[PDB]
Amino acid sequence: KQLIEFVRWSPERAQHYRNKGYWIDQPLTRILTVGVQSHPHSLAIICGERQLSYIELDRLSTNLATRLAEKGLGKGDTALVQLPNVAEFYIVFFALLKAGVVVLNALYSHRQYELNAFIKQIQPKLLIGSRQHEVFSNNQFIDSLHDVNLSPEIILMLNHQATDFGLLDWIETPAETFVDFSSTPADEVAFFQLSGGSTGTPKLIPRTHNDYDYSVRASAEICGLNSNTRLLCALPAPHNFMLSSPGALGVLHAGGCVVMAPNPEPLNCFSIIQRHQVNMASLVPSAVIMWLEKAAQYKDQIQSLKLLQVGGASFPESLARQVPEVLNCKLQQVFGMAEGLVNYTRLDDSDEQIFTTQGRPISSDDEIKIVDEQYREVPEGEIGMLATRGPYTFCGYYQSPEHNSQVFDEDNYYYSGDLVQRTPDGNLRVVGRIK
Ligand SMILES: Nc1ncnc2c1ncn2[C@@H]1O[C@H](COS(=O)(=O)NC(=O)c2cccc(O)c2O)[C@@H](O)[C@H]1O
Ligand SMILES: [Ca+2]
Ligand SMILES: [Ca+2]
Hints:
435 residues, alpha/beta, Rossmann fold, 7-stranded mixed beta sheet, 5-stranded mixed beta sheet, 20 strands, binds 5'-O-{[(2,3-dihydroxyphenyl)carbonyl]sulfamoyl}adenosine, binds calcium ion, ligase
């Protein structure tokens, strides 16, 4: 009965964000429902040989949701999902969104240590993972859970064993008895994002349907997504950048197709790009340099590529200028954070803007302060700490009133710890970090 707790925006702000049409009060599933009504047979996912259409994606994720409700998981429950870059990730994500189950999506690279702490924190009634992952190689982690009574009622395994509840069987066939389910309401938590800004253990970021959906819709527009967009998805699927900036979700919103890739390794990606005439990709700087090393020898395989976003870590101008000359596609720079705020260079910005800056916020209403060691705004152009609040920036980590009071100010701006400067045209330049 009790929905997951989070820190809310003020009602003044809630109202403003509905008034400007940012918050339209639909569930994240809107992406899918709308997609089914316009183009049920367009490709939504390409994963090696497989092709999932929008209605295939809608049907399969309905199956699993009915199947989970049958076992009485729904509004109030939480779930821990750990899945590699395969179509099942999205099927599952939609399933839980439809079910009303608030999900935390673990990175596949996360090991016992992190999975344990997430479990302790959100106490899932559902766990989903892969028998091919070192942690579910055998049973030591699962049995371990029994001994602290953090055992999930239900556990699904991809690449399951015979005595496992297989994920694929739960996706493939709908439940015998019909139980009722819906999404969490739109101004309540849809799921948990994770910070990359953390010492060791990632802090949990509640995101609501309203704020996430808005970030996705607005991002699709800033990047000019449309139904011909075919977006390579080589970064970890649950990462905010890859999910929503504009991400799988952005592409789904625009009626395009996501193209799966296990990781960002060049030869494998280059030839996934070739096979599916991928026209859009998203990478972090260390992966950009790998592609840069092999692109001249494979000019032919990667021509179809029209846009590459780079975000996630400092990106020297030196390398930025190489993207168009070497990768043969437009560059867009992205500076975002799981916590909220995302900045894009625009497609109509100048050469210099795009090579030397990390763009400007999604929303005219992303409010921004750049401040000095004593919390005063700095002179324009100077370097200070970024502080921000907006229509899609969280208002606290899950169940951490102590850390929250350290990283928010009286007026509810959030402090990322990034050192920025505003440029004379209006974009941001990420210059550093501070504790
Ligand atoms: N373009 C950038 N240049 C320099 N630093 C960056 C940049 N982008 C992110 N960072 C650092 O990474 C931190 C954010 O870490 S996260 O993992 O939460 N998210 C992302 O990384 C993320 C990147 C691009 C688009 C997105 O939507 C994202 O969510 C920021 O506080 C920055 O310190
Ligand atoms: Ca199909
Ligand atoms: Ca090209």
